[PDB]
Amino acid sequence: ALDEKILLLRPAFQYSDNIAKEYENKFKNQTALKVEQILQNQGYKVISVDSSDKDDLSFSQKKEGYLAVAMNGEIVLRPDPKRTIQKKSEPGLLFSTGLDKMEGVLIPAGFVKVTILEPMSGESLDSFTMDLSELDIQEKFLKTTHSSHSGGLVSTMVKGTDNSNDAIKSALNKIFANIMQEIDKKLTQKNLESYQKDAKELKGKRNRHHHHH
């Protein structure tokens, strides 16, 4: 079929501080692998590059490579500040829960940009940015601080809990799904092969640019 190589760069993602390192790493790794799957499904051989910066490509890689795909992003999950309810234990209301609870919703923010480049010149052949704020993600969470006028309460009646990490997981799942969906839209053998002319031209301009002076 196609003897053409695509250089897949490592995703460069920054996140908000509330997202665990484990979650960040799994996100990065699965992003890279799913993009790999997409490109292989469209008929290209994929070379995984041990970097995310196009300049750290070896000349070998720039040579064998038809195109390079670069991802970068800021993935933020923060509460919608309007929807944080802080209902506290009313002392003696016939039923007194000695736990103070908070209730909120996490919304997405930031961006993920995918860029198709010509390896030799490093010039951008195309790019699409997905705005994460545009996703309608509202993941409810509740955490329970141990309240102030409950010191006498014994261990059993004050078991705090927090489900933030589950909401973070759910939000990252949807984000990942919607993102891979867009990427699958864009990285079609038809879209990628439509760059072949400019890619040849740019390689040429930069391949001859090395051999003059």
Author numbering: 26 to 238
Give the authors' words:
H. pylori adhesin A (HpaA) stands out as a pivotal adhesin that plays an indispensable role in the successful establishment of colonization by the pathogen. Originally characterized as a neuraminyllactose-binding hemagglutinin, HpaA is a 26 kDa lipoprotein found on the bacterial surface and flagellar sheath. The gene encoding HpaA is prevalent in most H. pylori strains, and its amino-acid sequence displays a high degree of conservation among H. pylori isolates. For these reasons, HpaA is considered a promising vaccine candidate against H. pylori.
